[PDB]
Amino acid sequence: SPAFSNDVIRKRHYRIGLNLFNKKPEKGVQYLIERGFVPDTPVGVAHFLLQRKGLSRQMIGEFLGNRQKQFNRDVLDCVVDEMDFSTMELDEALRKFQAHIRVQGKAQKVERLIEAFSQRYCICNPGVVRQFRNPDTIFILAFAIILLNTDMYSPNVKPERKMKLEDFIKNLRGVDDGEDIPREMLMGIYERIRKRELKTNEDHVSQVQKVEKLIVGKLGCVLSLPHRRLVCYCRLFEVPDPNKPQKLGLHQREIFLFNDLLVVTKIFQKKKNSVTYSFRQSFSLYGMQVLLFENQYYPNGIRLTSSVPGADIKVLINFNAPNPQDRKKFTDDLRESIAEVQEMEKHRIESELEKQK
Amino acid sequence: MRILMVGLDAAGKTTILYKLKLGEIVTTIPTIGFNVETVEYKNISFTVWDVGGQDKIRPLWRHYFQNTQGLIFVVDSNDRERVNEAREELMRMLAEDELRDAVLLVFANKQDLPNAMNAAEITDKLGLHSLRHRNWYIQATCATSGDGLYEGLDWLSNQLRN
Ligand SMILES: Nc1nc2c(ncn2[C@@H]2O[C@H](COP(=O)(O)OP(=O)(O)O)[C@@H](OP(=O)(O)O)[C@H]2O)c(=O)[nH]1
């Protein structure tokens, strides 16, 4: 299916599938299967979500928690079956499970994951389930652990009555078909959560959030959308007039290229340990073109222009790169990003032209 | 002010929470679990808990229940098939002694849909008229457009002014 090992177009199509997933998981999966990037079995899709980087972990949870789709339910069961919960206490097992997917949001979504998790934990630990007068006690306790994690670590709670190990114990009184879960078990669970929060593994979006917080102005209109990935950061000097010359270090911008957007910033502090960005402007990639230019004043020049249907050609911005190498690098990355964005819109217009029938 | 937001799945609770919070700074990734956000209105801060934990995990929340000052009950006004189930869930909550003093705001949501039942019709279907020792208000809303939300908050802020 691909060209020489790995092909520009095929890699673009694979990235398009991932972009679609992060916006709509059911649509992204269908696309990947149809384009032969993912096999059609629930086990294959389960492996794919678990391994393959580039997927938003919040969106993995959205897909896996679908409760109504028979395919998703089977994907979840395969996902959970790949996990090794034997000989782990409930919090340890949940830490492992919740690291691969973001178990956060809508109560029905969290319930579906977690019910699938609880079934698996009980299968892997049948000697634990025998201690209980009711099997649903593992499911209930799993949510008590989740609720505790929220209570202890959500800033919206504030040390009002952030649960003590005693409040946690008493809250769970009578849960086991009228009887209590062992005090020492609950204490252990409590102390484990207190010592370390349930976190979810670093996503492709983790990096976008890291960037977004360093930016100070208009954060740059909530750039940390599930689909959004940061392609590269590069310093470039802004050229207001390519026809006139300027001082070397003049108009030092800091560019951030995301798969669908170009953000430009002047710096703020630099400081010692950390740098902060000002935010100058944001450019959507759709309909934009990149062109290199060299004149008597600028050697490694770049001009971004947007060609809209009818108003045709607008010079968005002009830049001078410090070296030909940086110019080439940035231009190649930006060009690829544009094409990726072009086919994405080309697709959604076709997908909509079919919906209308 | 502690607010518990309940109602059936698909009623629009999460949509409401994020629509209400939208105007306040999200500088950090929210902690693992269910939805909780603090909303400031007319200089009053409401911590709104967006819950739905089946009936299996219903005994929990009871820790909070003691200190809950207000209840927001969200109903999908277009879902006639589940209106009786919504009534059941509301009455099951209202029966709790821990919530005896809580004020009740009902959001008759999804008013944008052509077949949506009116606030007066929902009032009848939920049996709100039969409640006595309770401060309650029903507000027709469209969570997607934001219509009716701040009117609901006006009543709720006036009830709680703390
Ligand atoms: N038209 C309309 N839809 C609304 C309104 N409020 C919520 N919804 C829809 O209701 C669905 C579930 O609502 P949500 O806020 O997720 O709910 P919850 O109670 O399940 O937590 C969503 O549908 P989808 O998942 O299909 O997007 C959302 O778009 C409203 O006022 N009007």
Numbering used by the authors:
A (entry chain B): 393 to 610, 620 to 758
B (entry chain G): 18 to 179
Verbatim from the authors:
Here we analyzed how membranes control the efficiency of human BRAG2, an ArfGEF involved in receptor endocytosis, Wnt signaling, and tumor invasion. Arf GTPases are pivotal regulators of most aspects of intracellular membrane traffic. Members of this family carry a calmodulin-binding IQ motif in their N-terminus, a Sec7 nucleotide exchange domain followed by a PH domain and a predicted coiled-coil in their C-terminus. The crystal structure of an Arf1–BRAG2 complex that mimics a membrane-bound intermediate revealed an atypical PH domain that is constitutively anchored to the catalytic Sec7 domain and interacts with Arf.
We confirmed that BRAG2 has the hallmarks of an Arf1–GEF by showing that a mutant in which the catalytic glutamate was replaced by a lysine (BRAG2Sec7-PH/E498K) traps Arf1–GDP in an early intermediate of the exchange reaction and that removal of GDP yields the subsequent nucleotide-free Arf/ArfGEF intermediate. This allowed us to solve the crystal structure of the Arf1–GDP/BRAG2Sec7-PH/E498K complex in two crystal forms (crystallographic statistics in Table S1). Next, this expanded PH domain establishes a large intramolecular contact with the N-terminus of the Sec7 domain remote from the Arf-binding site. The interface buries a surface area of 1,800 Å2, suggesting that it is a constitutive rather than a regulatory intramolecular interaction. The crystal structure of the Arf1–GDP/BRAG2Sec7-PH complex captured the relative arrangement between Arf1, the catalytic Sec7 domain, and the PH domain in the course of the exchange reaction. First, it shows that Arf1 forms edge contacts with the PH domain. Next, the structure shows that BRAG2-bound Arf1–GDP has undergone a two-residue shift of the interswitch, a conformational change that has been shown to occur prior to GDP dissociation and to secure active Arf proteins to membranes (, reviewed in), suggesting that the complex mimics a membrane-bound intermediate of the exchange reaction.
